[model samples]
Target: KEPEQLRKLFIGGLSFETTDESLRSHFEQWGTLTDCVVMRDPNTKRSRGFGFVTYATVEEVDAAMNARPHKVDGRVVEPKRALTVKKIFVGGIKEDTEEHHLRDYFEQYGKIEVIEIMTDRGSGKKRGFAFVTFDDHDSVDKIVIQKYHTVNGHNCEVRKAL
Candidate 1:
């Protein structure tokens, strides 16, 4: 069962030793938690080192966002609005756009852990778009609201990648 108006949050940089209950306790100060999951390795049965916490209201989510420097068992934790996916599609890239250009432009928002430029499999040419993965989901929020999101004079459209 899901709580009405529930909003999910992504809790990252967790210690491998942290458990579901401990994660729940950390966020209980904000509000009621509808669900808390600490992803685990199916084979080794160990913590995947990250998890999701579902809160009962957007207000709770906002509270979590505003709160910072969360720690669990002494390790700094990263909390942000959990999206269904973190990879964002960068559309309308200039023809000559390269990986470094995208990385340079987006790095200000957050640490870009990965950059994948879509290209023609056969022709080996630029595909006019790319996919960028940021280390933090909160960076996506900052990037989306910029009045001028362009790359090399091309109007780059940024959206959550499917």
Candidate 2:
């Protein structure tokens, strides 16, 4: 991925009714699209009012951002080159710890979006790996410097997701 983000553009202030196809229609004129997404909430399924759009090249991103006053569904949306979501994979956590506690530990640096803990059948293994996503990439940027993080005295391996 080459440390990413010159090709993906973050679009903010989309109209509430904007759909993925509509968003794509607006940006496709600039270049070939790899993907375009309108973010939605996990529950109740509603638009999040913004999205990430991926074009095939940094140059395409350049043209689209300058394709200013970029409007979709009659509202002018703002564009920011996104540093895609930072999802960190953490493993070797002890069963004694809670995902809430791990979330709490990571909170020492800044706010996060979500934490997912998946375990073997019916929790048989007592511990499972975790996936942590931060609201902003900069937040995780500060946490992964050390390969091992001691979360409440229990150690775990941390790295960007494979």
Candidate 3:
């Protein structure tokens, strides 16, 4: 009867005791929920203690963020609008590179939302490349302008993620 809508929200501080049904119910009051996922362990299937909630509009997401220190399953949840993150591919990471080091290095550029060092799935080893996301796309521009960026003794290459 109505056209579909789209919005994304990041939910943090979820209690291990929370479930999908409960999470969805708590957020549904804010707006129509397209999906509510409580991230879980792939092997154990236990709550990862956080998840994403998709609503139909930006306004709905804004409402949810201002909903006032939401408590779910006895824990105060942090809810914020999840940006459609702009991803930049980082190449030439040294073997010793840690996620925090990369994050700290990138902070001077802008507000970083996530930094992930890509790894070989089978070996579980760093693939020498990382995917870094920023809350603002403009930060991506700040990074890509550098022809040669050195981090942790490695002269890394940076570009927008494909």
Candidate 4:
């Protein structure tokens, strides 16, 4: 795909110390950078252990993903201190929402590449969390900013899959 078609994503499993310079220094090996962000808490103002990285092109992002040493701050940052990469939930979803409903809602934002909505063990109902995959990284920003919420009064956040 064209480089212009490239996009961004939240890089999770990060060391709490991960900074913009560190992220840019590592990711620049892949391609030019458009933006980089490290999210932090508002109250305590601590690093959220995750950040967002935007590449100038899809190929760049692809190269970075394939590169080894997904590490940072002298730690194996790929996983959440245990696995190589931790699987996380898409927060801010409707409590009663189902897999199909979640898929249907997000699909409107981009191509529904993959969907996994959890269920409550006791009630066997939707857990109000999910994982979503889009056709490419570029779609993430558009979808995220446009729908930073849930249909039934839930707040939502997206990140990498385990």
Candidate 5:
């Protein structure tokens, strides 16, 4: 669910109409949807103005964003990465291994707010991991899209956080 949650999206603006199946069908062009929900009220008229859609890839999420000026029942709707993850926890890296090199790889995408590898009561290995905070939310999306990096001799894993 780590990266898949990145694919979840929040679609705002609807026509006070359309059911789960219809909305799903309408957004089906991106292909391989995890789900689409209209957030309908059981005892209400209208106000069904927002929905959420989860795709199978960040590329599809970008496609949905790229295919903007969107319409739902003839009205413009909007969407964004539902996870909105800006920080990530990385593991499988070797400790005392010149942490900045990790920065060398991750910083290419965007500005980083904070980054550091942790150690124990005296250079603790802590399972060879680090966390990175990005200045922009979109940075994590792109990085996860290109998951797995050289970080290369040691191999590493990434997951969304905070």
Candidate 6:
């Protein structure tokens, strides 16, 4: 994908009765759907009223969003709530570290929106932490939750800072 804003996304406001096939059958009308996963109740196996949809290309996703209510089951199904995107950062970085170093470190996962290390501003020393913003929150969540404490030999702690 050219940009994250155009990538796959989560779908919500679904009925508890929805199934994987029903969800995909609805979404596939828009484009080639790579995957459609409806989160279900852990115990009951019932729909969680939310799911994720992945298309072959970001352009397809962009098209879907731009079209609004992208037509599912003859009923326009729009995203009821903004999907939770992911964000992550390598923490405990040198306060004096420059933006390039910050970008170079986390950009390994995906494109970064911003990378800035915290500073005191008075004496201009490092704060031992940083804030890295990525275009896609999913990428952030994966790195922060799944890949924490193991980026670039830094053994850093990754988390959503903001």
Q: Say which candidate scores most in lDDT.
A: 1
Model 4 TM-score on a 0 to 1 scale: 0.44
lDDT score, candidate 6, position 125 = 77
List TM-scores for all candidates, in order: 0.52, 0.49, 0.48, 0.44, 0.53, 0.52
For candidate 5, the per-residue lDDT at 132 reads 92
Instruction: List per-prediction Cα lDDT, in the order shown.
Output: 0.80, 0.76, 0.79, 0.63, 0.75, 0.64
Q: Superposing all C-alpha atoms, what RMSD in Å does each candidate have to the true structure?
A: 8.0, 11.8, 12.4, 10.9, 5.9, 7.7
Native-to-model Cα distance after best TM-score fit, residue 49 in candidate 1, in Å: 22
lDDT comparing candidate 4 with the true structure: 0.63
lDDT of 6 at 129: 74
Tens-digit lDDT track of model 3 for 74-104? 8998765533337899988967889887888
Root mean square deviation (Cα) for candidate 6: 7.7
Candidate 6 overall lDDT versus native:
0.64
Residues 46-82, candidate 6, lDDT per residue (tens digit)? 7777788877776566555545655454444545212
lDDT of 1 by residue, 1-162 (tens): 444423788888999998989999988888888888899999998998999999988768767766777888789988766354557889999578988889888887777988999889999888899999977666676566455687777888898776
Off by over 4 Å in 3: 1-6, 83-162
**Cα lDDT, model 6, residue 17:** 66
Clashes in model 4: which pairs? Answer: 79-84, 92-155, 92-156
The residue-level lDDT of candidate 5 at 83 comes to: 74
Best model number under TM-score: 5
Give the per-residue lDDT digits (tens) of candidate 5, residues 1-162: 447777887777787776678778877777578888888777874456788888887768777765666787788876766477789888888755466877888888667888878677676555588889987666787777664666847777887887
Q: State the lDDT of candidate 4 residue by residue for 11-40, as single tens digits.
A: 777778878889778767778888887788
In model 5, which runs have C-alpha deviations exceeding 4 angstroms?
Answer: 1-8, 13-45, 52-60, 63-78, 82-84, 124-127, 141-149
Clashing pairs in 2: none
Rank list by lDDT: 1, 3, 2, 5, 6, 4
Model 5 TM-score is 0.53
